[PDB]
């Protein structure tokens, strides 16, 4: 019936129920063993691939009884699923399971589209480097065609002489040598046709292995001959012009295209109103603020301890003891003396006692409710407790763990609470990663899709040592494949991993292969895999960087000359020394004596205030409530209304006209700033 099939699917218990299977269906691909289809792991995960795939079949029939672009893939994920239970390609398109999540999440629905918009925009510029890549690839075929062959020993210059056996000499020793066959070998990247030449030049544009191609090209001599040492050293000009043209200028004129044309995403709308962006970043702060806590205590015994700690000499003492602990931690080294190994045991018990005494005194002076409310004291409470334990746990070692020694290193981070300019730079970028999580979600997905396909296509290469597929760098588990991919994103000999993955490799013996089929591992799909991954990733990472730089562009052009939130940030602290808690108003006996402490962009100047500061505070618009009751969310609009936005009279409610149309929504308590 169209009414029980309509209400079950719709609200909340169908979206948090099917998506928690998509996340678990995807984790079933990752947990697969690549080498053996016969594992007891690999058997029992196929029975979840019949447990999920009966549930998503319910999702189709419960949907296709309701109605008559993104659901034709959901029919593909079901149809491949029952089929897969070419068979080799019907396993590979079983990776499309996280793609039905980017339809159900509407935060995901949009960020995939913004990529596709930025793909069509960058296309014309892309054509120009694509034609430039072809122009250079043809120059390289005319320079280096047939010239990247060589022999095993460098004595033999033609293929006809490169026969038989020669001696290598281990450890450079002419007494110690072994016999090997000589062989006429071709360089893996060459300029022999135009298409290989584009592959060689793509590698040099990633900067990977480009001096290896450079010294091969300087040594090139004639067609079908081996290299001659420092033959044509002037062929560095070909490689250096290509790097300046492609790998620098073109790449830059691709990034700076995104930056200016992501400015338009914050500039394609039009604002001919009364108040501009700097009036916007100033008014709304006074509207939407909130007073805060200055946990000033009472009880002059507690105030005797409170006046010590918040003072400058206690902030100066404790930050000069973190410096000396950092120096004592730097002094440790390997094979050190007995009176040196233990003075990092004497002082580290000494530094622990000193920071455990500052934690106690801040409980006693700050009225211990008011200690844990401050976030940098929760961090200091965890360094205290974690370094009490390591002093005990090392003491209990010798009386009868390298993790708890880390707490010692962590105290260094405290120093960043004095630095306002580093902590403001840190917050501004950390929040912008936090605010835009789906742009980074895509990168996670790209790695995930690639790692499952890499395990399916490369996971049976043997881990032989001296090659690029080995115990440290393979596709045989999901953590390993992912790690290998990250290495490539970093571009850390990614083209040499690419060559270790093509056709003709040794399969590991625990693979299922016929006798006489050992070298049948690997595929020449590796070329599409690696280049594509390399290219998808570059787009993904620049996309994320420029989306984060967008978020904080008001800060990245904040122009500290004129005005900023920092004058405003400083103001709250001054106000907070008049309030035990928020409460709205303070007395009036502090409203005259307020204006002596503020910067002349916001307060007044250095000079004699008997003209300006005595009359203008009444002379400007201020609210008129009762005598000693004036509040924080009413002055702080008007207090910056001196610094900018001078007006004429009668139109004080014509402040509130542009406080709705050029403004956002209601801001209900704004009768305070009006009169």
């Amino acid at each position: 019936v169209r009414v029980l099939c309509h209400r079950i699917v719709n609200a909340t218990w169908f979206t948090n129920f099917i998506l928690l299977f998509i996340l678990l269906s995807s984790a079933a691909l990752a947990a697969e063993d690549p080498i053996r289809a016969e594992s007891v792991r690999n058997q029992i995960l196929g029975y979840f691939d019949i447990a999920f795939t009966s549930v998503f079949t319910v999702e189709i029939v419960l949907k296709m009884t309701t109605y008559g672009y993104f659901n034709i893939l959901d029919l593909l994920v079901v149809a491949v699923s029952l089929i897969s239970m070419v068979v080799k390609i019907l396993r590979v398109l079983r990776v499309l399971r996280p793609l039905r999540a980017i339809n159900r999440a509407k935060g995901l629905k949009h960020v995939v589209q913004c990529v596709f918009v930025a793909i069509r925009t960058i296309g014309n510029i892309v054509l120009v480097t694509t034609l430039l890549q072809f122009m250079f690839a043809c120059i390289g075929v005319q320079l280096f065609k047939g010239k990247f062959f060589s022999c095993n020993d460098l004595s033999k210059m033609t293929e006809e002489e490169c026969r038989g056996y020669y001696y290598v000499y281990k450890d450079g020793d002419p007494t110690q040598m072994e016999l090997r066959p000589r062989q006429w070998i071709h360089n893996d990247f060459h300029f022999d046709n135009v298409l290989s030449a584009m592959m060689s030049l793509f590698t040099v544009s990633t900067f990977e292995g480009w001096p290896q191609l450079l010294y091969r090209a300087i040594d090139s001599n004639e067609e079908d001959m081996g290299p001659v040492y420092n033959n044509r050293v002037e062929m560095a000009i070909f490689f250096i012009i290509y790097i300046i043209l492609i790998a620098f200028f073109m790449m830059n004129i691709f990034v700076g295209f995104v930056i200016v044309t992501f400015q338009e995403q914050g500039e394609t709308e039009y604002k001919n109103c009364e108040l501009d962006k700097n009036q916007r970043q100033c008014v709304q702060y006074a509207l939407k603020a909130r007073p805060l806590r200055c946990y000033i205590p009472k009880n002059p015994y507690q105030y005797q301890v409170w006046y010590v700690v918040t003072s400058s000499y206690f902030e100066y003492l404790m930050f000069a003891l973190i410096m000396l602990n950092t120096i004592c931690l730097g002094m440790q080294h390997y094979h050190q003396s007995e009176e040196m190994n233990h003075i990092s045991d004497i002082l580290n018990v000494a530094f622990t006692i000193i920071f455990t005494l500052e934690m106690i005194l801040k409980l006693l002076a700050f009225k211990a409710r008011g200690y844990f409310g401050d976030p940098w004291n929760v961090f200091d409470f965890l360094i205290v407790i974690g370094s009490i334990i390591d002093v005990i746990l090392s003491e209990i070692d010798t009386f009868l763990s390298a993790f708890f020694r880390l707490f010692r290193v962590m105290r260094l981070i405290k120093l960043l609470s004095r630095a306002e300019g580093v902590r403001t730079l840190l917050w501004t970028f950390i929040k912008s990663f936090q605010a835009l999580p789906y742009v980074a979600l895509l990168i996670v997905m790209l790695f995930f899709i690639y790692a499952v396909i890499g395990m399916q296509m490369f996971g049976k290469i043997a881990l032989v040592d001296g090659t690029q597929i080995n115990r440290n760098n393979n596709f045989q588990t999901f953590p390993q494949a992912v790690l290998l991919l990250f290495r490539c994103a970093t571009g850390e000999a990614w083209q040499e991993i690419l060559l270790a993955c093509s056709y003709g490799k040794l399969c590991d013996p625990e693979s299922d292969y016929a006798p006489g089929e050992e070298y049948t591992c690997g595929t020449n799909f590796a070329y599409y895999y690696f280049i594509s991954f390399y290219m998808l990733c570059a787009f993904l990472i620049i996309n994320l960087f420029v989306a984060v730089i967008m978020d904080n562009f008001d800060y990245l052009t904040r122009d500290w000359s004129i005005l900023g939130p920092h004058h405003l940030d400083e103001f709250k602290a001054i106000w907070a020394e008049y309030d035990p808690e928020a409460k709205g108003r303070i007395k009036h006996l502090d409203v005259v004596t307020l204006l002596r402490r503020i910067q002349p962009p916001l307060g007044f100047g250095k000079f004699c205030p008997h003209r300006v500061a005595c009359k203008r505070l009444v002379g400007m618009n201020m609210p008129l409530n009762s005598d000693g009751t004036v509040t924080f969310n009413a002055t702080l609009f008007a207090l910056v209304r001196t610094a900018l936005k001078i007006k004429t009279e009668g139109n004080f409610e014509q402040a509130n006209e542009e406080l709705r149309a050029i403004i956002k929504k209601i801001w209900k308590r704004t009768s305070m700033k009006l009169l």
Binding site: T326, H333, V409, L415, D465, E492, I549, L556
Partner: protein, 224 residues
């Protein structure tokens, strides 16, 4: 030198050769000339080879001689005032990770596999020398007829390790550049096992490289 002579006496005395001094560019010109005669005499009397390398300061007299190149270095130096809070963040981050590495990996990469009875390090033909372990989490040294003993100076002729604060800080700066950082990861795996130390390395390459470059780039965008 006669240029430095005819440009103090076309002006006058000491406070007129201070008018030769007040601009910072001629300050560069006089340290070169004095230094130039300071090595050319001490070379003759010693009849110096390390003071010869200061002659490469002479091509910087050519930027004092082109006026349209003195407007760039000023604007080059001007862009460094926005990027100082970043450069102090990068610095303390290399200090954090260097010390952690020192505690965690200090003296750990000193055993390689050798030929039995000998002082000859055993490798495969394309393999570089890496740490071993005996009966633990590391790699077991299984080439052929080899055993591993700990008398080895380390992974790149004894350069890249975490034995003291200076060499730990050089291997961390080298990783933060993204050049050779997976060699150092793989060597630590070889020495002590592959279960934990990727957490050290991936976190450094993500904060110390990628996150740092988003802020440096951001500052550049703000300036331009």
């Amino acid at each position: 030198s006669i240029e430095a002579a005819m440009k103090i006496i076309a002006y006058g005395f000491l406070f007129h050769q201070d008018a030769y001094l007040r601009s910072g560019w001629n300050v560069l010109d006089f340290i070169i000339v004095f230094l130039g005669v300071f090595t050319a005499i001490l070379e003759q009397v010693n009849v110096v080879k390390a003071l010869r390398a200061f002659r490469v300061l002479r091509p910087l007299r050519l930027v004092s001689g082109v006026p349209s190149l003195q407007v760039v270095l000023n604007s080059i130096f001007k862009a460094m005032l926005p990027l100082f809070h970043i450069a102090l963040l990068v610095l303390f981050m290399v200090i954090i990770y260097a010390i952690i590495g020192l505690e965690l990996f200090k003296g750990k990469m000193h055993k390689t596999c050798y030929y039995i009875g000998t002082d000859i390090v055993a490798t495969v033909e394309n393999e570089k020398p890496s740490p071993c372990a005996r009966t633990g989490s590391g790699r077991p040294c299984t080439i052929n007829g080899s055993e591993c003993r700990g008398g080895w100076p380390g992974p790149n002729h004894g350069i890249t390790h975490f034995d003291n604060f200076g060499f730990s800080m050089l291997t961390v700066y080298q990783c933060i550049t993204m050049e050779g950082w997976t060699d150092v990861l793989y060597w630590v795996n070889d020495a002590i096992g592959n279960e934990w130390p990727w957490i050290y390395f991936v976190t450094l390459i993500l904060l110390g490289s990628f996150f740092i470059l988003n802020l440096v780039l951001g500052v550049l965008s703000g300036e331009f």
